[PDB]
């Protein structure tokens, strides 16, 4: 099937067509993979504005969005609030426990879930979902495992690319 | 016509020659597309210094500059103040409402307006203006719609490239 | 407006939808612009098989194909024979002459013609047609003049990309059949 | 799973482990897709010596090699002779015919076959085999269909990369011997 | 030997197999080589999250990690605390003085040490260790001196690449 | 002549041999061309650590270093303090006035001065000096005017490249 | 000054404005540096048609063209005949000899001459002329010596780029006419 | 340790300083690895003129040059004749045989020999010499084994880069003279 990032397989489009929940890793997926730290204890992360638009589009097109994080951080809470993401698990790590809880609370089967990751810690959940996605510049060992590898790098619009894929697959782009 | 970024078409040069108002998107055009967020509620964006010089040159060469934004932010107000941009619409529901108001207030026809964007939300106004510009690394669906696609990426000097184009077209470079 | 090479404009797709004749330059469009010459007067030129597949798809999908080239070589006649191309004009640098001949011979309006070029010599014809195309690595002064600039370079599948575009625009891409020769 | 070209999936490695016959397209796979033509009817094609080394390694490591190509040229018979390839089908664009012939002649199940292609004409056979491979610079519509996309371009060592993959999967890479010819 | 970043020499793999202590330069190795400075005296540096995971893996796989720095900075102390790095020398004149001290305190021979650097100041210690590593975008004069040059740039996952190499060599990846 | 960044002309090496004062533009030369602005009035710029080492090497090898700036900023003052740069002209812009003053105060001829710039505003002074340098990613109209165009981009080590060139030329690298 | 390949210096433009004779190396300048050799003593070289267009534009715009090469091959004579080049020196590695001959034959001062080279053998003549040019992919030791370094590689349109530069400098670019052969 | 291609290690420079014999593979080192084949049994190979210049510089600067190649073709004899190479071994895939012959014929210790290769077949000889070199685009499994990896690709000036390295290491680069043929 034709996409604005290049051809995708029929299998990936079919997986995309059925997604009701999009789970997004933060570091290296929503961000550039960096953490900015300062001498007064400041901590910043950089998110991508066009990803934000994609997320808002998904949320208004009957695709739930969730984030699972290993450490509570106000900046992540603030980003979720800005975007309307209400499913945020923090201080977890481990992703399976939150994944299982999320699926129970939403009554959504794993085949109807997509997950976008950049590192090996993402694989246990990615292995279980309907559409697993590695970002273009993910850890090299993750890349061949995923159903779809984005064209765009983490923090640069990989998430927008996935939102665009789901919306296209579902006739909502 | 010859430019320091490579050839442009006669049609683009002719459009550029007539521009009295340059409207600039912020995120992904003036910036690198990122938003830096911190755990104390800090918010930063990165602007490009050579873009600033271009904007000052435009403003002193009888080309008005305006910005239309979806959310009031002191950092954008400050950037405008530094550069001498006085036409700033913030917290805007869309872009057409501010566009229409701007054109009435300035008594300038749409053909004498340029707009530089990076995403689909920019297209409704871009469709109406004399010179529409997509930055080099804009969303892929926007790129083919624009009159001119910059060589330089958002936040890296795309805006300077557009200012340089207008000034060259108008014999002011 | 998605294509397998990237997005195209609505305007380019609409122009492509109307094409009944695809005219190609040879050197720099069907080849990468090289002319091979030997000490015994031998000459070679290299063509790309995936362009051959595109040309066969076009020819079998109601899109005629013609060639207008400034050089003259029997090898080009042979290439046309392989591909079933029956409209070849060689030794012609004033390409408007051949263009006028084709409009008459094929009873076709210029808006229903596409032309793929790489150098300034191609512009007089490109200016007149419904869909003008510059290959990705065309002369820098030709590039901004064309309706569509290919993603793929001359000799490397620019012609295939144009064939794919016409077929897609005309709803013929999925069912098109060619030989990659 | 580590290779000298980058990680591959467990699925691709498992498919590779089972290959007893490697089928190759010629133009765009064993070459970069160019056909050289001259004024006296001469034709040349270019092959890559490191692909030759891979093919020799495969043939001496209990992996048979066959070629199915839409063009027909004596020069291809000569290249096969250099490399010891004894299964050549030329002038065939309906590649399923030659494929069926090979399955019978070599008494082999399709799951034990790999096919390396670059254009849509290759897909009907690729669809049926155990390991389908598109070269790095294959037609964009073929790329997403294949089990494995090579890192290296057609004519530049894509075939060598596939030979190396099969040998690695089968525990034969370290001890394989070839000639880089 | 095969690695997920490409082939490495037998000699480099053999050096990697024996590493009990990994010493990491900060600027241009753990970071992007930048220092972010503000008008209120703010100072930030950007670390890479996937590097952090590599470091944690090394530390839980019997490979000690140390950092030697030329200026005490809370942000570096905080990064070390987050990752479990306890060997941090700051405000250092040399790197050799800290290196010597570290090896005495840990009773580890230089052949069992790896060092990852990006500039000429790193060379005196790199010259002495078992596995010297220059990052991909290190100063050009350092690159040919090192046993191994990473594929990944400083701040982008060069450190993760080295951790992955050590763990692979030691059968722990 | 041979350099670690590639060949340079005999003319450029000869100009470099005679440099007693190196003048550095800040934005797009010492920095990445960005200015980071926040909603509490924060302003950050990013400097390159390896450039800092080059500057210290120049200063200890009888090459004075100066900076001329268009706006007083504590972050620039702090960077200069860290590096031992004592010739800092701020709130200037033009650059000729400071240049002339600097040369009078130091009793140095223009032929013994190098200047590294990235934009057209740098050209009037660059035109007068012994060794004019445009960074790799300077404004396109500046590039052909300079005696030397660096291989490395602004904020990424262009300044270190120039320091390395001067030191090599003077037999001090 | 803006050019279609990027900005050039005022000094280069002023040098270009004064050129009445353009001297070209062959291998690595008019070609990508390859020499094709066969088992029967055949030899081929490849030239670029867009360079042909530039040469035709120059020759018809009062800029003479000459070639000085270290090799000797009839095929080079044939290429000169195609393009109307009437000043060819082959088998000459001490290129100062041919250069002196040209200055006398064409009654021209060295400042009115341009030379395009790719290797150190070209430098003795380049040192003497008004505009010296190294192609983009010239030997690294030649590159810093030249007045202008082309953006385009040898054999790929470096010569065209130089022709375009001279014509632009002389106010002849828009009206120049060539054949892309 | 600065070179015109980038920095080299002190160890590589010291190895280069001692070289009296430079041995070259052909396919993939002196060429980009392609073999051109025709329907009448024609064969072509392409060599690079700047490599020719380096070889002439080496030969006139007390560095002998030899070739050991797995293929056999008269065209290679002709190339050696052009360049003054008098030590050619063709049809040889067990390259240790030719290597031993050279050591005896030239009364030379292996530490005074350099070898430039591109595939695994070259490794047995490379393992024994004072300076082993893999070209930039050598097979990925060869690259980490070599003392020096060239910056320039096979057929594109990797051999010239090695010649330049030896000459620089021996204080002969400035004064070296060649022909770019
Ligand atoms: Cl033509
Ligand atoms: Cl075929
Ligand atoms: Cl020559
Ligand atoms: Cl061989
Ligand atoms: Mg992550
Ligand atoms: Mg935007
Ligand atoms: Mg042409
Ligand atoms: Mg094919
Ligand atoms: Mg450092
Ligand atoms: Mg600046
Ligand atoms: Mg030459
Ligand atoms: Mg070889």
UniProtKB/Swiss-Prot annotation, chains A, B, E, F:
What is catalyzed by this enzyme?
Answer: 3-deoxy-alpha-D-manno-2-octulosonate-8-phosphate + H2O = 3-deoxy-alpha-D-manno-oct-2-ulosonate + phosphate
S-S pairs: none
Does the keyword section mention Magnesium? yes
What EC number(s) has UniProt assigned to this enzyme?
3.1.3.45
Task: Name any Gene Ontology BP term.
Answer: lipopolysaccharide biosynthetic process
The UniProt record gives the binding positions of Mg(2+) as 25, 27, 118
Q: What class of enzyme is it?
A: hydrolase
Tell me one Pfam family matched here. Answer: Hydrolase_3
Pathway participation: Carbohydrate biosynthesis; 3-deoxy-D-manno-octulosonate biosynthesis; 3-deoxy-D-manno-octulosonate from D-ribulose 5-phosphate: step 3/3; Bacterial outer membrane biogenesis; lipopolysaccharide biosynthesis
Q: Name one GO molecular function term.
A: N-acylneuraminate cytidylyltransferase activity
Co-factor requirement: Mg(2+)
Q: Which InterPro entries match?
A: CMP-NeuNAc_synthase (IPR050793), HAD-like_sf (IPR036412), HAD_sf (IPR023214), KdsC_fam (IPR010023)
Do the record's keywords include Hydrolase?
A: yes
Residues bound to substrate? 27, 48-52, 56, 71, 79, 95
Please state which protein family the record places this protein in.
Belongs to the KdsC family.
Its biological purpose: Catalyzes the hydrolysis of 3-deoxy-D-manno-octulosonate 8-phosphate (KDO 8-P) to 3-deoxy-D-manno-octulosonate (KDO) and inorganic phosphate.
Quaternary structure per UniProt? Homotetramer.
**Which named protein is this?**
3-deoxy-D-manno-octulosonate 8-phosphate phosphatase KdsC
- Source organism per entry reads Escherichia coli O6:H1 (strain CFT073 / ATCC 700928 / UPEC)
């Amino acid at each position: 099937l034709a996409t604005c990032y290049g051809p995708v397989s029929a299998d990936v489009m079919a997986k995309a067509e059925n997604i009701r929940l999009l789970i997004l890793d933060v570091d290296g997926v929503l961000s550039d993979g960096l953490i900015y730290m300062g001498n007064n204890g400041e901590e910043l992360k950089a998110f991508n504005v066009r990803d934000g638009y994609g997320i808002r589009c998904a949320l208004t097109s009957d695709i739930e969005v969730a984030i699972i994080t290993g450490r509570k951080a106000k900046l992540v809470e603030d980003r979720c609030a800005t975007l309307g993401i209400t499913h945020l698990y923090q201080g977890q790590s481990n992703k399976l426990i939150a994944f299982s809880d999320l699926l129970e609370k939403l009554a959504i089967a794993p085949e109807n879930v997509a997950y976008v990751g950049d590192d090996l810690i993402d694989w246990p959940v990615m292995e279980k979902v309907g559409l697993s996605v590695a970002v273009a510049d993910a850890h090299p060992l993750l890349i061949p495992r995923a159903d779809y590898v984005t064209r765009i790098a983490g923090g640069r619009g990989a998430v927008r690319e996935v939102c665009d894929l789901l919306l296209l697959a579902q006739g909502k782009l």
